[PDB]
Amino acid sequence: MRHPLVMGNWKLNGSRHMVHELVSNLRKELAGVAGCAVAIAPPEMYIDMAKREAEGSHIMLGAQNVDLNLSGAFTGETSAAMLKDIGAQYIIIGHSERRTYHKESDELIAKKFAVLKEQGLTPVLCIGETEAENEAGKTEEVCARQIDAVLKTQGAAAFEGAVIAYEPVWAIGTGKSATPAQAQAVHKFIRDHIAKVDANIAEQVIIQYGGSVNASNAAELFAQPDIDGALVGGASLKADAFAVIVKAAEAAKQA
Amino acid sequence: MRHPLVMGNWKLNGSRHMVHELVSNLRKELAGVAGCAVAIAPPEMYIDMAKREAEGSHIMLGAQNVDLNLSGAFTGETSAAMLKDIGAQYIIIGHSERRTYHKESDELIAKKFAVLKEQGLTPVLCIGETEAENEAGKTEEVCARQIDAVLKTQGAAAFEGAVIAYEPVWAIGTGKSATPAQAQAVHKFIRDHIAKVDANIAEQVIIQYGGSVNASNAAELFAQPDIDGALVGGASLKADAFAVIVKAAEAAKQA
Numbered sequence A, B: 001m002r003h004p005l006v007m008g009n010w011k012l013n014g015s016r017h018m019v020h021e022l023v024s025n026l027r028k029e030l031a032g033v034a035g036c037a038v039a040i041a042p043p044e045m046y047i048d049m050a051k052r053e054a055e056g057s058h059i060m061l062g063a064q065n066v067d068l069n070l071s072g073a074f075t076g077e078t079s080a081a082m083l084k085d086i087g088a089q090y091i092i093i094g095h096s097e098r099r100t101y102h103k104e105s106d107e108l109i110a111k112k113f114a115v116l117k118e119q120g121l122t123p124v125l126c127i128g129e130t131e132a133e134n135e136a137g138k139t140e141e142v143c144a145r146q147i148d149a150v151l152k153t154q155g156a157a158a159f160e161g162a163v164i165a166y167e168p169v170w171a172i173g174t175g176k177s178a179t180p181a182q183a184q185a186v187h188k189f190i191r192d193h194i195a196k197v198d199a200n201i202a203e204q205v206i207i208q209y210g211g212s213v214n215a216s217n218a219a220e221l222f223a224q225p226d227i228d229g230a231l232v233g234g235a236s237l238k239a240d241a242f243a244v245i246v247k248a249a250e251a252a253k254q255a
């Protein structure tokens, strides 16, 4: 009975022309969708415009990162209070691109998670193992560590309403890809890990697949029982492709 | 002969309500000002809104930071192309809060400067020495090093149309204060340093004072020949206190 969520991570892509075109096309392609929740995370300067463009549709807003302070003398930072104020709900934290390029630690990401919960925002907690970690047979240990930074400091209750996105980092720019069976094995492990602390919370947590998802492979991934949607990368930038993914999630999970 | 510039760095302060109120009040308080340029840098998510509220005023927009990529798979980053697209003109880079809290190196800041120049945006390059550096008599050495990261890698023409903001970190909220004579000595040094590579570029660079400016010292600071305005922190959150600084800059250079 978990209602799927398909979220578009636009990454560093956007312009006022593009926001209008893409959100308008998304509204049209998604106007008949009932069985899947949808969120988009444009670059921070476009959240307000995208929110305005999405008014009248069921498309929810989000953001790609957040910092730790709500206000103060912190030049260039992003406030959870302001993200809430501007209309963002689903906030991506711990994306592999930020863990790598910006050295964001497990502990820092758990702190972001806490700030978001205090604001009534929905963290989209990204976790996943690297190529070296995967080769060492560490997939489970790494996912557990990343989840534990939150679970062991804030309890299972912190995952009520939250979203986890599993990114097999080892499949990024390596030519490789995870199969739906491989993806499912990891999602079931993540859910079982949380279940060790609170089985009820585990059953309600939305676990999205964050590896490569496109119009072609969405159906096979969403047929898996512990895959509750996707955090979509490149396919998020074209309304037609993104819509096929949303409809595939709808079809896979509907009664 | 340099037209002064007073810029408000809002830091991590802003909301929908505060943007509407502050921008409206600023336009009212700045009525009749023509001899001093004015820019504001709200948190990134509010730049678009602030620009719209600024319509009908002479207030120019800006931002508090930028990253190095224009587009791509860089979740949570800020693109200079998008800042330009959203209407931000004056982009603060290398602020002491980012050099310290986010460990931004001289080299990284110089790369930000380059991306801004490539896009045709105006960098507001912040430089300045710490408490210890000041006590050790290293003010000039530090300022030269921070400027050289750009000057020696990009050439003196990089500073055509650019802004430099000198922040006396050693004196900002520390119990010690910089006199106008002391600020003037640093500004003159900065301009002389650039002049060693290109005298014509040096004479057109806008060098703002970034230390504590209030109504009581604005007149004496702005009477100094090498001080072309100020990068204002806390006072930029109150229309009346910010306008007093702008009017002092106008009055001083029209004296």
Ligand code: NA
Pocket (backbone or CB within 6 Å): A076, A077, A078, B044, B065, B078
């Ligand atoms: Na930022």
